[PDB]
Design an enzyme around this catalytic site. Structure first.
Site, PDB file in Angstrom:
ATOM      1  N   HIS A  62     -29.544 -46.576 -11.816  1.00 55.08           N
ATOM      2  CA  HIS A  62     -28.946 -45.405 -13.092  1.00 55.08           C
ATOM      3  C   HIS A  62     -28.275 -44.300 -12.555  1.00 55.08           C
ATOM      4  O   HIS A  62     -27.438 -43.834 -13.184  1.00 55.08           O
ATOM      5  CB  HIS A  62     -30.224 -45.345 -14.000  1.00 55.08           C
ATOM      6  N   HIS A  92     -30.783 -35.404  -9.324  1.00 55.65           N
ATOM      7  CA  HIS A  92     -29.775 -36.242  -9.606  1.00 55.65           C
ATOM      8  C   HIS A  92     -28.720 -36.116 -10.293  1.00 55.65           C
ATOM      9  O   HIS A  92     -28.622 -34.798 -10.821  1.00 55.65           O
ATOM     10  CB  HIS A  92     -30.249 -37.430 -10.355  1.00 55.65           C
ATOM     11  N   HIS A  94     -25.061 -37.052 -13.507  1.00 51.15           N
ATOM     12  CA  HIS A  94     -24.855 -37.904 -14.397  1.00 51.15           C
ATOM     13  C   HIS A  94     -23.135 -37.766 -14.216  1.00 51.15           C
ATOM     14  O   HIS A  94     -22.764 -36.522 -14.029  1.00 51.15           O
ATOM     15  CB  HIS A  94     -25.333 -37.635 -15.734  1.00 51.15           C
ATOM     16  N   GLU A 104     -23.735 -34.826 -19.732  1.00 50.91           N
ATOM     17  CA  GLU A 104     -24.526 -35.041 -20.832  1.00 50.91           C
ATOM     18  C   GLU A 104     -24.805 -34.012 -21.845  1.00 50.91           C
ATOM     19  O   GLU A 104     -24.231 -34.219 -23.085  1.00 50.91           O
ATOM     20  CB  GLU A 104     -25.969 -35.461 -20.515  1.00 50.91           C
ATOM     21  N   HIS A 117     -28.776 -32.589 -12.539  1.00 47.53           N
ATOM     22  CA  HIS A 117     -30.240 -32.215 -13.199  1.00 47.53           C
ATOM     23  C   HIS A 117     -31.165 -32.294 -11.779  1.00 47.53           C
ATOM     24  O   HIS A 117     -31.576 -32.854 -11.275  1.00 47.53           O
ATOM     25  CB  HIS A 117     -30.734 -33.505 -13.859  1.00 47.53           C
ATOM     26  N   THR A 196     -33.279 -37.674 -20.756  1.00 43.23           N
ATOM     27  CA  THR A 196     -31.946 -38.059 -21.130  1.00 43.23           C
ATOM     28  C   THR A 196     -31.933 -39.906 -21.146  1.00 43.23           C
ATOM     29  O   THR A 196     -30.982 -40.271 -21.397  1.00 43.23           O
ATOM     30  CB  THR A 196     -30.890 -37.544 -20.745  1.00 43.23           C
ATOM     31  N   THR A 197     -32.837 -40.455 -20.248  1.00 39.27           N
ATOM     32  CA  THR A 197     -32.829 -41.872 -20.227  1.00 39.27           C
ATOM     33  C   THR A 197     -34.241 -42.264 -20.640  1.00 39.27           C
ATOM     34  O   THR A 197     -35.248 -41.552 -20.626  1.00 39.27           O
ATOM     35  CB  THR A 197     -32.767 -42.473 -18.731  1.00 39.27           C
TER      36      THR A 197
END
Ligand SMILES: NS(=O)(=O)c1ccc(NC(=O)CN2C(=O)NC3(CCCCC3)C2=O)cc1
Ligand SMILES: [Zn+2]
Length: 258
Positions: A62, A92, A94, A104, A117, A196-197
């Site tokens: 992911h 991590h 995005h 995000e 994040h 957010t996941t």
């Protein structure tokens, strides 16, 4: 879990296995800079990463996580909207397929190329798995990335990505100093939200820095060579691993700055 970011398993599908996807404090959100209000109740933010101990970098299918030793108070976040002490466990990103998308959170509907994040858990709950069951369990420090000059402190991350191309691959990643990923200013917005996941748990105090960091086109192009798939499987580039903005509902975004 077969959730992902594709047409058939992406954010518009998540609610079927994770009904909290349609909840009252989901993340990310659009930050309307004109509506966010300065909050004088906010205490000074304290990012104390001097003793941070990085251990490992993992492609989880992911994103990729840089994981830290969180067995003691080595790298912590305190202050701002937070009551008590939050320990850094992992960071991590995005990111997008192109420079105009990937974040995000959005700022007046602007999308950045990527979003960092730094995930922290509240030490009053003893372990991460207990903390995610609490409305104040986590604090995630969000930092926008724009494409421009290279970020020197990112390059050790970029250079190991070749060794973790596919889902389930990890590599030792010791002695990485996450202070090299911060912007100069700690001005921020804050609001109560979620992971957010999946599993989208409503356990996060979001702290989103106003000042983006700059990374180079070359740095973010290396993020985009990662794979969502496992080794030996058809290649699916790890791009557009972002959830879009969710309804604000009964929330106010507070600013740390006048
Ligand atoms: N985009 S985000 O909102 O910052 C965000 C989204 C999802 C997550 N998900 C998690 O952390 C999922 N997760 C658990 O629940 N437990 C572990 C950590 C502790 C050891 C066991 C594995 C784990 O990795 C974190 C941040
Ligand atoms: Zn994230």
């Amino acid at each position: 879990h077969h959730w992902g970011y594709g047409k058939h398993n992406g954010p518009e599908h998540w609610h079927k296995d994770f009904p909290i996807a349609k909840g009252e404090r989901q993340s990310p959100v659009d930050i309307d800079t004109h509506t966010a209000k300065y909050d004088p109740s906010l205490k000074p933010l304290s990012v104390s990463y001097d003793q941070a101990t990085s251990l490992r970098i993992l492609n989880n299918g992911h994103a990729f996580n840089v994981e830290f030793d969180d067995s003691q108070d080595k790298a912590v976040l305190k202050g701002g909207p937070l009551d008590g002490t939050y320990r850094l466990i992992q960071f991590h990103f995005h990111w997008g397929s192109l420079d105009g998308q990937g974040s995000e959170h959005t700022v007046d509907k602007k999308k950045y190329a990527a979003e960092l994040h730094l995930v922290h858990w509240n030490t009053k709950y003893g372990d991460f798995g207990k903390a995610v069951q609490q409305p104040d369990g986590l604090a995630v420090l969000g930092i926008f990335l724009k494409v421009g000059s290279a970020k020197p402190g990112l390059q050790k991350v970029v250079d190991v990505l070749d060794s973790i191309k596919t889902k389930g691959k990890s590599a030792d990643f010791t002695n990485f100093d996450p202070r090299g990923l911060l912007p100069e200013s700690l001005d921020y917005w804050t609001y109560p939200g979620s992971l957010t996941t999946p599993p989208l748990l409503e356990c996060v105090t979001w702290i989103v820095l106003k000042e983006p960091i700059s990374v180079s086109s070359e740095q973010v192009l290396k993020f985009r060579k990662l794979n969502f798939n496992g080794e030996g499987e058809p290649e699916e580039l790890m791009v557009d691993n972002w959830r879009p903005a969710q309804p604000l509902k009964n929330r106010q975004i507070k600013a740390s700055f006048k």
